Design an enzyme around this catalytic site. Structure first.
Site, PDB file in Angstrom:
ATOM      1  N   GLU A  55       0.813  -1.209   0.000  1.00 10.93           N
ATOM      2  CA  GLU A  55       0.000   0.000   0.000  1.00 10.93           C
ATOM      3  C   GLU A  55       0.880   1.309   0.000  1.00 10.93           C
ATOM      4  O   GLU A  55       2.097   1.266  -0.090  1.00 10.93           O
ATOM      5  CB  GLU A  55      -1.059  -0.140   1.175  1.00 10.93           C
TER       6      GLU A  55
ATOM      7  N   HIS B 231      -0.105  -5.597  13.943  1.00  9.54           N
ATOM      8  CA  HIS B 231      -0.924  -6.790  13.554  1.00  9.54           C
ATOM      9  C   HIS B 231      -0.089  -7.909  12.803  1.00  9.54           C
ATOM     10  O   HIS B 231      -0.147  -9.083  13.197  1.00  9.54           O
ATOM     11  CB  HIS B 231      -2.066  -6.116  12.735  1.00  9.54           C
ATOM     12  N   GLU B 232       0.700  -7.542  11.765  1.00  8.79           N
ATOM     13  CA  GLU B 232       1.587  -8.544  11.088  1.00  8.79           C
ATOM     14  C   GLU B 232       2.766  -9.037  11.977  1.00  8.79           C
ATOM     15  O   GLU B 232       3.033 -10.227  11.906  1.00  8.79           O
ATOM     16  CB  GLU B 232       2.003  -7.970   9.703  1.00  8.79           C
TER      17      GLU B 232
ATOM     18  N   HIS C 299       0.999 -11.599  14.151  1.00 10.78           N
ATOM     19  CA  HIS C 299       0.960 -12.850  13.369  1.00 10.78           C
ATOM     20  C   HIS C 299       2.359 -13.494  13.454  1.00 10.78           C
ATOM     21  O   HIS C 299       2.369 -14.698  13.747  1.00 10.78           O
ATOM     22  CB  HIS C 299       0.473 -12.701  11.929  1.00 10.78           C
TER      23      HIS C 299
ATOM     24  N   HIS D 250      -6.411 -14.707  14.619  1.00  9.77           N
ATOM     25  CA  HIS D 250      -7.537 -13.759  14.355  1.00  9.77           C
ATOM     26  C   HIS D 250      -8.604 -13.670  15.458  1.00  9.77           C
ATOM     27  O   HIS D 250      -9.290 -14.646  15.741  1.00  9.77           O
ATOM     28  CB  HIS D 250      -8.177 -14.064  12.982  1.00  9.77           C
TER      29      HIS D 250
HETATM   30  C1  LIG Z   1       2.476 -19.168   8.951  1.00  9.39           C
HETATM   31  N1  LIG Z   1       1.247 -19.644   9.663  1.00  9.39           N
HETATM   32  C2  LIG Z   1       0.020 -19.306   9.312  1.00  9.39           C
HETATM   33  O1  LIG Z   1      -0.765 -19.962  10.008  1.00  9.39           O
HETATM   34  C3  LIG Z   1      -0.425 -18.292   8.189  1.00  9.39           C
HETATM   35  C4  LIG Z   1      -0.103 -18.597   6.691  1.00  9.39           C
HETATM   36  C5  LIG Z   1      -0.764 -17.705   5.634  1.00  9.39           C
HETATM   37  C6  LIG Z   1      -0.052 -16.635   5.121  1.00  9.39           C
HETATM   38  C7  LIG Z   1      -0.656 -15.678   4.281  1.00  9.39           C
HETATM   39  C8  LIG Z   1      -2.015 -15.824   3.962  1.00  9.39           C
HETATM   40  C9  LIG Z   1      -2.713 -16.951   4.397  1.00  9.39           C
HETATM   41  C10 LIG Z   1      -2.097 -17.871   5.241  1.00  9.39           C
HETATM   42  N2  LIG Z   1      -0.013 -16.907   8.570  1.00  9.39           N
HETATM   43  C11 LIG Z   1      -0.844 -15.893   8.572  1.00  9.39           C
HETATM   44  O2  LIG Z   1      -2.093 -16.020   8.681  1.00  9.39           O
HETATM   45  N3  LIG Z   1      -0.355 -14.724   8.248  1.00  9.39           N
HETATM   46  C12 LIG Z   1      -1.147 -13.634   7.784  1.00  9.39           C
HETATM   47  N4  LIG Z   1      -0.657 -12.703   7.095  1.00  9.39           N
HETATM   48  N5  LIG Z   1      -1.475 -11.702   6.717  1.00  9.39           N
HETATM   49  C13 LIG Z   1      -2.732 -11.903   7.107  1.00  9.39           C
HETATM   50  S1  LIG Z   1      -3.924 -10.854   6.810  1.00  9.39           S
HETATM   51  S2  LIG Z   1      -2.854 -13.354   8.073  1.00  9.39           S
HETATM   52 CA   LIG Z   2      -2.201  -5.839  -1.019  1.00 13.57          CA
HETATM   53 CA   LIG Z   3       3.907   0.349  -1.785  1.00 11.53          CA
HETATM   54 ZN   LIG Z   4      -4.480 -10.591   9.407  1.00  9.54          ZN
END
Ligand SMILES: CNC(=O)[C@H](Cc1ccccc1)NC(=O)Nc1nnc(S)s1
Ligand SMILES: [Ca+2]
Ligand SMILES: [Ca+2]
Ligand SMILES: [Zn+2]
Ligand SMILES: [Ca+2]
Ligand SMILES: [Zn+2]
Length: 168
Positions: free
Chosen positions: A102, A119-120, A123, A129
């Site tokens: 972004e 937030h990231e 994660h 979530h």
């Molecule tokens: C590594 N272990 C996990 O369980 C997941 C993998 C993943 C990664 C990316 C998309 C779907 C799924 N990590 C995760 O949800 N990360 C996120 N990043 N950004 C979000 S919004 S939610």
């Molecule tokens: Ca994007």
């Molecule tokens: Ca950018």
């Molecule tokens: Zn997320």
């Protein structure tokens, strides 16, 4: 609050983090001022420390990807996916990887880097979530006009107190 399948958390109190690259939409000193706000995030939890690096390996490498690089998940460009934000574990699990995502801003006008980094990095540290809206770990980025009202809700504090053990 919710956690990833199996409950993946970091078995060590003092941390070690590496910054990969800086985005073109923001200067160096703001990206580093809020990486320091989430690093403290951890340090205000329980005693979770953090050491800044620029070279080597330490599985909290804060990262980026302009469309593609070579792993598993391709990017969309504008909207939805903030990063493949990766959670506790070995190598690929730990560390971040943004899209050319972004238009990064210090305030809410373009896209707030504080909200997205807390937030990231969240994660990357264990939490998945939370279905609440005000708890930060919500699936979609909204629009907090007044950034002074951004506080971590009681739900997340009670859960991670019961996750790593309260502060001394
Ligand atoms: C590594 N272990 C996990 O369980 C997941 C993998 C993943 C990664 C990316 C998309 C779907 C799924 N990590 C995760 O949800 N990360 C996120 N990043 N950004 C979000 S919004 S939610
Ligand atoms: Ca994007
Ligand atoms: Ca950018
Ligand atoms: Zn997320
Ligand atoms: Ca990783
Ligand atoms: Zn990656």
């Amino acid at each position: 609050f919710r956690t990833f399948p199996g409950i993946p958390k970091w078995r060590k109190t003092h941390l070690t983090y590496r910054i990969v690259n800086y985005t073109p939409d923001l200067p160096k000193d703001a990206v580093d001022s809020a990486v320091e706000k989430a690093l403290k995030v951890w340090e205000e939890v329980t005693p979770l420390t953090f050491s800044r690096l620029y070279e080597g390996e330490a599985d909290i490498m804060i990262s980026f990807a302009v469309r593609e690089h070579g792993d598993f998940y391709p990017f969309d460009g504008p909207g939805n996916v903030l990063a493949h934000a990766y959670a506790p574990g070995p190598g690929i699990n730990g560390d971040a990887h943004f899209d050319d995502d972004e238009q990064w801003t210090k305030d809410t006008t373009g896209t707030n880097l504080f909200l997205v980094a807390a937030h990231e990095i969240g994660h990357s540290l264990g939490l998945f979530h939370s279905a609440n809206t005000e708890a930060l770990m919500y699936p979609l980025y909204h629009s907090l006009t007044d950034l002074t009202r951004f506080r971590l809700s009681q739900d997340d504090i009670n859960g991670i107190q019961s996750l790593y053990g309260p502060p001394p």
